[PDB]
Amino acid sequence: LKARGGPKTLRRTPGVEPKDIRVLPGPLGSGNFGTVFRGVFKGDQDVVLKNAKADVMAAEELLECEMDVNYHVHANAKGTCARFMGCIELGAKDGGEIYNGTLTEGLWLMWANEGENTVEALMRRGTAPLATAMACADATELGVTKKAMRELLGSLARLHECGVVHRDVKPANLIAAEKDGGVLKLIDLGAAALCLPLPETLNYYPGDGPADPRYAKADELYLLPPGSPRPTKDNAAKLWEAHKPDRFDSWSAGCVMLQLAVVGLRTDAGLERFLADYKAVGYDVNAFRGEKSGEYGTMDFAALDANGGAGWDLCQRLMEAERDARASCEAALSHAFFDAAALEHHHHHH
Amino acid sequence: LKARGGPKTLRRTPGVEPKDIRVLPGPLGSGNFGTVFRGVFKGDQDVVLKNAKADVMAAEELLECEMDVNYHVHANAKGTCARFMGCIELGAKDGGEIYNGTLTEGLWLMWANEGENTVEALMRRGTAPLATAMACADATELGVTKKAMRELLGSLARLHECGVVHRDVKPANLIAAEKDGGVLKLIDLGAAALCLPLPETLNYYPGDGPADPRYAKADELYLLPPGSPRPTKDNAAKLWEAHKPDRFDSWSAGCVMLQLAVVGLRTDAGLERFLADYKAVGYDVNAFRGEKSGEYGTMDFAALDANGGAGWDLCQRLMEAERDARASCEAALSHAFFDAAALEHH
Ligand SMILES: [Mg+2]
Ligand SMILES: [Mg+2]
Ligand SMILES: [Mg+2]
Ligand SMILES: [Mg+2]
C-alpha cells in the first residue's frame, strides 16, 4: 500500500493575510536568531516583520517563544512595547521572495512600526532631536532623563508585574512613539522570559543566557544563577523572590539612565569606560564621584548632580552590585529624581 | 597618588595599515558574533572584512579564535578557504564609522573577496548560472555535483589532515572563485575547531555547540559527545580516532551533495523534507528509494541514479547514522562517483 499524506497546517492571525503584506528588502537588523524587516500592511500601515534565521540552531523555537511572550504582553501590558499584530506562517508553494516583496516560507511575526527612530540613534544625534521626538518640554539632559526614565521604569514595572523580564533593555530597544505623544516603547522581546507559571514559564532557565555585554553586569549574564533549581510551577514564586531576575532589567535601566543623563556616556566606549571605573571602586557611585569623576573632564555630570545628586542616587539604586540591594523598577519610580520642583510651573498656572 | 596610564597594544599585519582600507556599508550578513563587510584594500584589491558584534557575549573572544584558526589554515591548507590577509586592530580615538568608509574600534579580520556569488545563491538561480560560475563544462546536475563535490571533499580532507573541522559546511559558505578557474572555496571558520595541539586545541570541547540545523544531524550537534574527556595535548589523537569529529563535516558535505544533485532539494523546505524522510527510514538511502522516493514526484533524482546509483551510494557513505560507519572526506574522494569516463573516443 501507499501512505496517504494529508494537508499542511499553517498558523495565522484573523484579519492578517499574506497577500496584504509587502516586505521591504533590507534588514532593520539581524539579532541573534532572527531578521527584522520593514513592511507595509494593507497598502497604508507601516509595520515591522520578523522571521527566524535559517542558519541558527533552534531559531524557530526562539521565535515561537518570542511569539508567546508577545501574546502575553499584548494581553497584560498594552503600551509597554511595540504593538503586536500577530503572526503569519507561509508554506513552501505559497512562500515568496524578499526581493519580490513577498513573505518567504516559514513563521513571521508582525508589529506596528512605532517610529523610524531609536533612542540610541536620537541620543547620538543629540539631546535636542531626542527631546523633540519624545515631546519633552525640558530639552536638557536632565529633562529627557526624567521623562524617559519615568516611562521606561513604569513599563518595566508593568512587565515585571505580569512575570516578564525583558532581558535586552537598552537605548537601541526603545522608540519614542510619535503616534502616542512621543512616549517611549520597548521593542524586542526575543530574549524575554516569562518567569511565572502563567501557565508555564518561557525562556527561563538557570545559568547564563544571551545578554548584551554593554547592558549587563559582567558577572550577572543570567536571570537565575547556576546554583538555582530549574524553574517549575511549584518553585517559580520562590525563585522570583530569591534570585530577583527582574533586577537584570534594573541594571540595564541604570545603563540607559547614565547614557541619557551624560552626553559623553552615549558612545559604547564612554559607557564602557564609566562602568569599568564603577566596578573598580566597588560599584559605589560616591566613590566614583570622589575618586574618578575628576578624570572625566570632557563630560558634564550636571543631570546626575542636580537636586542634591538625586540622579546619582537613583543610578546607585538601579546599579547596586548585589541583587538583594538593587531597586526594583517599581520602587525606582518613587525616587526623588522624579519629584516636581517646589512650585514647578507656577508662572503659568491658573 | 594616582595609578599611571600606559600604552595600548594593537595587533597589526605587516603591510596593512589603517589608511589602506576603505569599508563599504552593508553586511554580507551578520552571523552569530560578527559582521562581514565588503572593502577595498590599497585602492584596487577587493576584500571582505569582519568585526565583532558589540551586542553579543564574548564576541571579541570568538573572533580571536576565528583569527587563530585562519592563521592555521593559511599556513597549512592554502586554497581550501578564502585567502586570509591578516588583521587590523583599531583603538577608540583612531577608529571611524562604517557609513563613512572607515574601520571602527576593535579587531578586524581581512580576506580576499573570492567572488560575489555563493553556491547557495547560484544553485537557487539554477544549474546553468552555477555551472558557468564553476567553469563546469558538464552543465547538468550530475556535472556540477561531480566537480563541486571533488573540490569540497578535497578541501575538507586537507583541513582535516591539519586538524581543522570546519563545522559550518553548506552552500552558503562556498564561493565559486572565478579568478581561480571557478574552483570552490570555503568561507567562515567562525565555528571551526583546531582538534590537534598545535600548540593547543581551539574551540574544541565536549557537547553541543553552534550548528546550522539544516546541515547538522539533529542528534549530533557536537564535535565531541557530551560524555567525552575535555581535550588535552595528550589525549587529542585518541579523541580524534574515537569520536571522529571530522565526520561532522562529512554529514554536511552529504547535504551539499543532495542539493547540488537534485534541484527540488535546493530550498530549505525541500532538503528538510528529504532529511525527515531519510531519518524516518533509518538513515538508509536504499530504503528511501524504495519506500519514499515515489512521494517526490515533482523532483528528478537522475544525477544520484546515474552509473549504478553511484551518487546515492556516495551520499549514503557521507550520511551514515553512525560516525564509525560514516566515510571520511578523504575516503569519499576515492569513490566511483568521481571516476573518469572510460573509453572516450577523443
Ligand atoms: Mg526555514
Ligand atoms: Mg513547520
Ligand atoms: Mg535583542
Ligand atoms: Mg557560520
What Å resolution does this PDB entry report?
1.4
Q: How far is the CA of B168 from the centre of ligand 4 (A)?
A: 5
Within this chain, do residues A280 and A331 fall inside the same structural domain, yes or no? yes
Burial A189-208 (b: 16+ CB within 10 A, else e): bbbbbbbbbbeebbbbebee
Within this chain, do residues A196 and A245 fall inside the same structural domain, yes or no? yes
Within this chain, do residues A259 and A178 fall inside the same structural domain, yes or no? yes
Within this chain, do residues B107 and B143 fall inside the same structural domain, yes or no? no
3-state SS, residue B89? strand
Shortest Cα distance, chain B CAs vs residue A339, angstroms: 34
CB contact under 8 A, A57 and B210: yes
Tally of structural domains, chain A: 2
Within this chain, do residues A124 and A249 fall inside the same structural domain, yes or no? yes
Within this chain, do residues A43 and A146 fall inside the same structural domain, yes or no? no
Q: Which residues of A touch B (CB under 8 A)?
A: 2-3, 5, 27, 30-32, 54-59, 92, 95, 105, 172, 208, 210-214, 221, 268-269
Tell me whether residue B173 is annotated as binding.
yes
The residue with cell 522516493 is B293
- CATH number, position B169: 1.10.510.10
Range of the domain at B333: 114-346
Q: Which residues of B touch A (CB under 8 A)?
A: 27, 29-32, 54-58, 92, 105, 170, 172, 210-214, 216, 221, 267-270, 294-295
- Chain A residues with CB-CB distance to B29 below 8 A: 30
DSSP run (H or E) holding B132: helix B127-134
The residue with cell 519624545 is A134
CB contact under 8 A, A210 and B270: no
- CATH number, position B2: 3.30.200.20
Strands A174-177 and A183-186: antiparallel
Within this chain, do residues A129 and A72 fall inside the same structural domain, yes or no? no
Q: Answer for the pair B255, B214: CB distance below 8 angstroms, yes or no.
A: yes
Strands A193-194 and A183-186: unpaired
Pick the last residue of a domain from A61, A94, A113: A113
Closest partner residue to B57 among A55, A95, A211, by Cβ? Answer: A211
Within this chain, do residues B100 and B130 fall inside the same structural domain, yes or no? no
Within this chain, do residues A177 and A92 fall inside the same structural domain, yes or no? no
- Best CA proximity match to A201, nearest among A209, A193, A213: A193
Within this chain, do residues B272 and B137 fall inside the same structural domain, yes or no? yes
Task: Name B31's Cβ contacts closer than 8 Å, sequence gap at least 6.
Answer: A55, B188, B190
Grid cell, residue B225, equals 559527545
Q: Answer for the pair B194, B204: CB distance below 8 angstroms, yes or no.
A: yes
Widest distance between CA atoms in chain A: 89
Cα–Cα distance, B200 to B181 (Å, whole number):
35
Within this chain, do residues A134 and A109 fall inside the same structural domain, yes or no? no
Cα–Cα distance, A303 to A8 (Å, whole number):
58
CB contact under 8 A, B56 and A210: yes
Pick the last residue of a domain from B69, B95, B113: B113
- Chain B residues with CB-CB distance to A268 below 8 A: 54
Strands A193-194 and A164-165: antiparallel
Shortest Cα distance, chain A CAs vs residue B104, angstroms: 11
CB contact under 8 A, A269 and B56: no
Q: Answer for the pair B169, B205: CB distance below 8 angstroms, yes or no.
A: no
Tell me whether residue A168 is annotated as binding.
yes
Cα–Cα distance, B290 to B299 (Å, whole number):
15
Q: Answer for the pair A155, A80: CB distance below 8 angstroms, yes or no.
A: yes
Within this chain, do residues A106 and A187 fall inside the same structural domain, yes or no? no
A329 CA to centre of own chain: 13
Pick the last residue of a domain from A56, A83, A113: A113
Grid cell, residue A267, equals 558612545
- Which segments of chain A does DSSP mark as H helices, in order? 59-76, 119-125, 127-133, 141-161, 236-243, 247-261, 268-280, 285-291, 302-318, 329-332
Geometric angle at alpha carbon A29, from A27 and A30, rounded to 5° = 100
CB contact under 8 A, B268 and A32: no
